[PDB]
């Protein structure tokens, strides 16, 4: 799988993309790797922010499905025209395949001005695949049409300009140290999992188990932040705040309403806590824990148009769709989406940003009771 | 105040704007009326989506304040350069004034491609005025520098193309029928108020009082939706769902993940509930209630690029910053922001969209105990 190592590029806060080709003859496009949705979509008209776009007129193998698709957000959106053509992945496995494709033809706040990607790859499951679950996701199609094993893994590094590896087909043991630990995929819609216990530094939020996964905890290459629900963000942030009382910072800052700054080589790593999420483990009453440094949740804002100092942003933030384990968490770890086995594995990333003191860990086993009672229904 | 009647234009879901002039000689710009923030900001560089922009080079009366300003969102943002020049409002009161102005010089997902506004007018209070409360908001400046009375009112109509009236200086009794009822402004930061009871159709959500204002209920001309917190959105939506069991609709729809449709002249108003929020009243244990129809929370998506039927959207949605009473609620009513008296008044809007059956109401007085215990602290 060295072929596939280092095959993801991207820029800070704009997401990770992989090169794919679509249609015969092949039209290359950078597509954004997204474990939080289940549609394969490309810009198909000359939107001014796109470097490239799907020109269906140049592909012999295109096939309209005479149907629309209207994916809204809060408040982005995109809409398009379902077709099917032959997709391939240059720095991936050596299979071409025929998958569905939404040709994006109108959109709001979807494309990012100054990014180098022209489309999304939704690697989650049919159940959330708009317009409805009849729309067979790419990865279901890739597996169903080849010998390629039903899994993929992701090592998102991020150094400005970011990089990583999407190993389609298996695991590459050069991307991680220590051992992989597995939390089961609770249901095949998003990559939904269950945090059974949350510590900041060691002392946990003694919160009711259910509040960590209200109404959902998911793993998302497509979200930037670690996103906690309101009740829990409230809780975590207070313990983070108390933790962090070598100093004071503005109120808004925490709610992602300002940046905070120090000078080159002059930031306090160690005044800030390590965080640890315990995820449900493979066995009854067994769990394990993954631990992030503040390098992961304090991420620099690169080009700030009125600032020369180190102005990092706070990467943890609130929600109502649930916990979203974004690049903040995922950049700590080699993450394996074992779809074959309804489970996600976490190991210490061979490229995560560690200092001389602390470090990211994946550690187990621990004993946790009533892990199943931390779902919501 | 007829001078000021009908002085707001806008387009569906894109917001309400009023014409202002900035600098000498005066440069006209459409600015977006926003009760949810406290900064006056104009695009000052040729962003491709702007019709117009502040050219400080043409104004004698400009004055740099040699300071930046970096307003992020989730995940829009803008940043700019604080100055001060002479603002006026053509279809407003006949005063020119010297207020602060952030010249917006970089931004992300802030301006709307295809809108006709080039700036924001933040009519809330200094406390939330970025970069900090020393930045005197326009309206504080307008009052402090003229005889203009410390209040304004808003009648947002929305019919496509929307319209309304911002009466700066007082109230115009032609804009409402019945009587005005006043909920007090709890703190002068946002226009924060307190919902003491919530019904759908009549039967309330029997929810703990605090969950309606966790952590905030505000009144926002700048938000489109009625936005409830997660716990309460969960609650309301279930009662809305049960209410609405003459029919079934997709799961996503409710979470603003799809549109829903019927044919021209063929939509079920009456299968859907009226909603009623009870707001804290002026006297101890006294409250009143405002009531919206489904015309207010079911708002048409205008030009849909793969649809000919009536496809309305669901205007109620979740949050973690709190309740946000947006154009959904505000379009029902003539809303008076009596800043002089730390209070907001609600009357039946002379332009709200009512059918022959039901109608929007403002009704009181009711008896409600422990209204003060519905805050959060
Ligand atoms: N997992 C996702 N996918 C999306 C759509 C793709 C997208 C759009 C913008 C950005 C910015 C950074 N990553 C992005 C991904 C939205 C979302 O809410 N969750
Ligand atoms: N009250 C506000 N003001 C803003 C900024 C202005 C704005 C931007 C986009 C739209 C779309 C519809 N109305 C808008 C207002 C953001 C926000 O979250 N709350």
Structural topology:
The structure is a homodimer of 377-residue chains.
Chain A: E1 8-11, E2 15-22, E3 27-34, E4 40-43, E5 68-72, E6 77-88, E7 97-108, E8 119-122, H1 138-144, E9 151-156, E10 161-168, E11 176-184, E12 195-200, E13 203-204, E14 217-219, E15 226-227, H2 230-243, H3 251-254, E16 260-262, E17 275-280, E18 286-292, H4 294-297, E19 298-300, E20 310-314, E21 316-317, E22 323-325, H5 327-330, E23 333-338, E24 343-349, E25 361-367
Parallel strand pairs in A: 3-8, 4-7, 14-22, 15-21
Antiparallel strand pairs in A: 1-2, 1-10, 2-3, 2-6, 4-8, 5-6, 6-7, 9-10, 9-23, 11-24, 12-13, 12-17, 15-22, 16-20, 17-18, 18-25, 19-20, 23-24
The complex binds 2-amino-6-[2-(1H-indol-6-yl)ethyl]pyrimidin-4(3H)-one (2 copies).
